[PDB]
């Protein structure tokens, strides 16, 4: 194959230079489990038992015993497949554009296949990370003109039936009000018996800079970050709390546990960018190639995510 498909050989040689996605830091190693499909739906069944009555004492002779019931719930996850196209130079035509310091036509913005594939893969990975964090797909910084997606396709920020708090516009700079809302959300969180688990928080850089301020008269040797860590430890049964900063978020705070039993990411094994065999070829030196990627696969329990939005209006 590599002796016939030069594009496949180039992709194999250049796949190493692609950097790992940043979404891996947001999840524990046990929370992510690859599945096998490209587009469609999958169903998961969870079985839970319950007790119907008080236990029975085993004394002398008895045949009437208490019973244990069972129940199940089924959750459907929708996936999607998307593709992008990019132009590049034909392999036989590269020798006529090679230069001492570079390869490609600067005046016409034409690149060798390896470089074009690497850049396109980087862009697609950035888009995948944005979708995973925010649950929406868009190329505008304004966030409008979004691509309408399928139901049962949610991200961490748009997951339904989760706890959402709103900090008012006038109190956007009041860290005490922000922490009041955070405490209310943490109180309204419901983790069941799996509460003894590590927790993860994602904040925007502005919120991080606000946090790194000394904790408020004023005090010292203690920061708002430490206060938040203690507050989260008050509910996670003194378990570890991690804090991360993502430029994708805007005046928003995400809090969620790192336990697989509550939140699990089961993405497709073809989610990451993959080259397509179809290569358009003409009489000219310009060729076209396609990259495919799969989106979807986030499963969460009800009322286990806290979403704090600070209104900047």
């Amino acid at each position: 194959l590599f002796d016939e498909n030069y594009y496949a050989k180039a992709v194999a040689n250049i796949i190493g230079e692609v950097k790992d996605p940043i979404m891996y830091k947001w999840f524990s190693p046990d929370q992510i489990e690859d599945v096998d499909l490209q587009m469609g739906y999958q169903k998961t069944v969870k079985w839970d038992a319950f007790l119907n009555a008080n236990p029975t004492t085993i004394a002398n002779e008895v045949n009437t015993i208490s019973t244990i019931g069972f129940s199940s719930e089924v959750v459907r996850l929708n996936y999607l497949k998307l593709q992008y196209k990019f132009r590049h130079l034909k392999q036989t035509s590269e020798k006529f554009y090679t230069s001492d310091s570079y390869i490609g036509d600067i005046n016409n913005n034409l690149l060798p296949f390896a470089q074009a594939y690497k850049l396109a893969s980087s862009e697609i990975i950035k888009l995948i990370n944005h979708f995973v964090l925010t649950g929406t797909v868009s190329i505008q910084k304004d966030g409008k003109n979004q691509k309408r997606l399928l139901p049962n396709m949610y991200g961490l920020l748009n997951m339904p039936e989760q706890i959402k708090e709103e900090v008012a516009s006038g109190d956007k700079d009041k860290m005490d009000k922000i922490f009041e809302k955070i405490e209310a959300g943490l109180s309204k969180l419901e983790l069941g018996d799996e509460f003894s688990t590590p927790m993860m928080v994602i904040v925007d850089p502005a919120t991080s800079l606000k946090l790194v301020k000394p904790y408020a008269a004023a005090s010292s040797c203690e920061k708002w970050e430490d206060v938040l860590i203690q507050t989260i430890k008050a509910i996670n049964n003194r378990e570890d709390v991690y804090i991360e900063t993502s430029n994708l978020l805007k005046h928003k705070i995400l809090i969620y546990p790192l336990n697989s039993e509550l939140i699990k990411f089961k993405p497709s094994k073809y989610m990451l960018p993959t080259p397509n065999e179809q290569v358009d070829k003409d009489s000219t030196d310009v060729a076209h190639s396609y990259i495919d990627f799969v989106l979807g696969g986030l499963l969460a329990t009800r009322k286990t995510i806290l979403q704090v939005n600070i209104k900047q209006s």
């Binding site: 194959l1 590599f2 498909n5 496949a8 992709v11 194999a12 796949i15 190493g16 790992d20 891996y24 830091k25 190693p29 992510i32 690859d34 570890d240 991690y242 094994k269 073809y270 990451l272 993959t274 065999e277």
Partner: protein, 37 residues
């Protein structure tokens, strides 16, 4: 069946894609092995 193995020689595009997916999975596992918070 991964692109990291030099001895591996794919025979068709399906094997190539499967090797790409295996390489991605192995890189993810290596990242989680070498990750420290």
């Amino acid at each position: 069946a991964s692109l990291l193995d030099s001895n591996f020689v794919p025979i068709n595009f399906t094997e190539f894609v499967q090797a790409i997916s295996n390489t991605y999975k192995q890189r993810r596992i290596q990242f989680y092995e070498n990750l420290k918070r």
